[PDB]
From a paper:
In S. cerevisiae, the HORMAD protein Hop1 mediates the enrichment of axis proteins at nucleosome-rich islands through a central chromatin-binding region (CBR). Here, we use cryoelectron microscopy to show that the Hop1 CBR directly recognizes bent nucleosomal DNA through a composite interface in its PHD and winged helix–turn–helix domains. The Hop1 CBR comprises tightly associated PHD and winged helix–turn–helix (wHTH) domains and directly recognizes the bent DNA on nucleosomes. In S. cerevisiae, the HORMAD ortholog Hop1 contributes to axial element integrity and acts in the very early stages of meiotic recombination by mediating the recruitment of the DSB-forming endonuclease Spo11 and its accessory proteins.
We could purify the isolated S. cerevisiae Hop1 CBR (residues 322–537) but could not identify crystallization conditions. After screening the equivalent domain from several budding yeast Hop1 proteins, we determined a 1.5 Å-resolution crystal structure of the Hop1 CBR from Vanderwaltozyma polyspora (residues 317–535; 34% identical to S. cerevisiae Hop1 in this region) using single-wavelength anomalous diffraction methods (SAD) with the two natively bound zinc atoms (“Methods”). The V. polyspora Hop1 CBR structure reveals a compact assembly with a PHD domain (residues 319–374) and a variant winged helix–turn–helix (wHTH) domain (residues 375–439) with a C-terminal extension that we term HTH-C (residues 440–524). The N-terminal PHD domain coordinates two zinc ions through seven conserved cysteine residues and one conserved histidine residue. The wHTH and HTH-C domains fold together, with the HTH-C region forming an elaborated β-sheet wing on the wHTH domain and a long C-terminal ɑ-helix stretching across both the PHD and wHTH domains. Examining our structure of the V. polyspora Hop1 CBR reveals that in Saccharomycetaceae Hop1 proteins, the PHD domain’s canonical lysine binding pocket is poorly conserved and largely lacking hydrophobic residues. This lack of conservation casts doubt on whether the Hop1 PHD domain could bind a histone tail equivalently to other PHD domain proteins. Moreover, a comparison of the Hop1 CBR structure with those of DNA-bound wHTH domains reveals that in Hop1, the canonical wHTH DNA-binding surface is partially occluded by the PHD and HTH-C domains (not shown). Thus, if the Hop1 CBR directly binds nucleosome-rich chromatin as suggested by prior studies, it likely does so in a manner unlike canonical PHD or wHTH domain proteins. The overall structure of the nucleosome-bound S. cerevisiae Hop1 CBR in our cryo-EM map closely matches our crystal structure of the V. polyspora Hop1 CBR (overall Cɑ r.m.s.d. of 1.06 Å), with the most significant difference being that a disordered loop in the HTH-C domain of the V. polyspora Hop1 CBR is well-ordered and interacting with DNA in the nucleosome-bound S. cerevisiae Hop1 CBR.
Residue numbers in the entry: 319 to 440, 460 to 524
Amino acid sequence: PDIECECDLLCPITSTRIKQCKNCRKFVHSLCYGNKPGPKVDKCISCVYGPMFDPSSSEFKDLMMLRKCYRFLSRNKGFPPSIKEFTNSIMEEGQVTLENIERINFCISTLSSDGILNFSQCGNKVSIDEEGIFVPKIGELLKGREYMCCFIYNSDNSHACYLDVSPESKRQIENWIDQVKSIRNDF
Ligand SMILES: [Zn+2]
Ligand SMILES: [Zn+2]
């Protein structure tokens, strides 16, 4: 199938299912659609927003990566054995660029700030094979070291933009994007 998920990235077939929009019949990633069970989404993000939607923006790409990262971690019941193993689960190795390395590091840092990922010195043990991730208390996860990482599904500091399962309205989607703009501002 031709995948037309709004993230506009390949996703490894072992990391996600494919779902179909009932309204426009296109295929999307289950990771980007809340891991919602089953084969369908009643209306995809584009169909809910309507034709004026612009998925090309940096902030919308940040949003979809956050959603994808959270839902992969939820499906995996925690963090993979290393940063690069996580990266190569979220994306196809061959498609990885500096822009999306930065974006994935932003997602990891954000989920750590939000209390979804909780890193500590030595959950799952995680090898740091990429520099540039900052987390509370520890600060920078040092390349070449290992840390323990505890994943929890929700926290009082989480953001709804990655916890919400499905798109429900144009205003909801706009608020998702506003949330990520705010996170970047504070980042
Ligand atoms: Zn996607
Ligand atoms: Zn659709």
